[PDB]
Amino acid sequence: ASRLYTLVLVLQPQRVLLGMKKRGFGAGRWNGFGGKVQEGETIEDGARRELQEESGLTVDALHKVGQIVFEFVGEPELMDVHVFCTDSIQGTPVESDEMRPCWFQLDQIPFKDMWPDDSYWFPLLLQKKKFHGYFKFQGQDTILDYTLREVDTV
Ligand SMILES: Cc1ccc(-c2nc(=O)[nH]c3ccccc23)cc1
């Protein structure tokens, strides 16, 4: 019982782009760009589509960097999040009613205002590692348990 989602991090040598979500799921936190994958669409094509919808940016080549499964206690459906990176984009980030993009220097990543799992896997993303994770949450602020392992193949 899992549902597919994407998450894309625009990661350049000295800075990363995050978006502050203004409403709906994740509102009030910084995160990368993503969403649900459609019927008949590949995961990677979903990732590309959602980056455009949410940031204004056009990506060509996406690189796989992780898979993370999220469980909320009491909720039947698991989120199966496929995480991607890119360093090369076209366009300028767009602020919309849904999202406010900003660049962050890599020593100023706003962990306190991100989902709390990110403290665990973002350091791996920054060192170009790939990973499989599982995080069990109670509500949106507490991690009850987790596993996280580096992998060679996502
Ligand atoms: C589309 C989409 C929405 C939310 C997330 C998401 N990102 C994180 O960094 N941590 C989480 C923790 C629990 C549930 C979701 C998340 C990813 C993708």
Swiss-Prot record:
Residues where 2-oxo-dATP binds: 6, 31, 33-36, 115-118
Phenotype for residue 34 to R: Reduces activity by 97%
Expression sites by tissue: Widely expressed with highest expression in thymus, testis, embryo and proliferating blood lymphocytes.
Essential cofactor(s): Mg(2+)
Binding sites annotated in the UniProt record for 8-oxo-dGTP: 6, 21, 31, 33-36, 115-118
PTM statement from Swiss-Prot or TrEMBL: The N-terminus is blocked.
UniProt cross-references to Pfam families, sorted A to Z: NUDIX
Domain of life, source organism: Eukaryota
Sequence motif: Nudix box, positions: 35-56
EC number: 3.6.1.56, 3.6.1.-
CDD domains in alphabetical order: NUDIX_MTH1_Nudt1 (cd03427)
pH dependence: Optimum pH is 7.8-8.2 with 8-oxo-dGTP as substrate, and 8.0-8.5 with 2-oxo-dATP as substrate.
Residues that hold N(6)-methyl-AMP according to the record: 6, 21, 115-118
Gene Ontology CC terms, in alphabetical order: cytoplasm; cytosol; mitochondrial matrix; mitochondrion; nucleus
Variant or mutagenesis effect after changing residue 150 to A: Reduces 2-oxo-dATPase and 8-oxo-dGTPase activities and increases thermolability
Binding, Mg(2+) 1: 34, 54, 98
Gene3D superfamilies: Nucleoside Triphosphate Pyrophosphohydrolase (3.90.79.10)
Residues holding Mg(2+) 2: 50, 53
Function of the protein: Oxidized purine nucleoside triphosphate hydrolase which is a prominent sanitizer of the oxidized nucleotide pool. Catalyzes the hydrolysis of 2-oxo-dATP (2-hydroxy-dATP) into 2-oxo-dAMP. Also has a significant hydrolase activity toward 2-oxo-ATP, 8-oxo-dGTP and 8-oxo-dATP. Through the hydrolysis of oxidized purine nucleoside triphosphates, prevents their incorporation into DNA and the subsequent transversions A:T to C:G and G:C to T:A. Also catalyzes the hydrolysis of methylated purine nucleoside triphosphate preventing their integration into DNA.
Protein name: Oxidized purine nucleoside triphosphate hydrolase
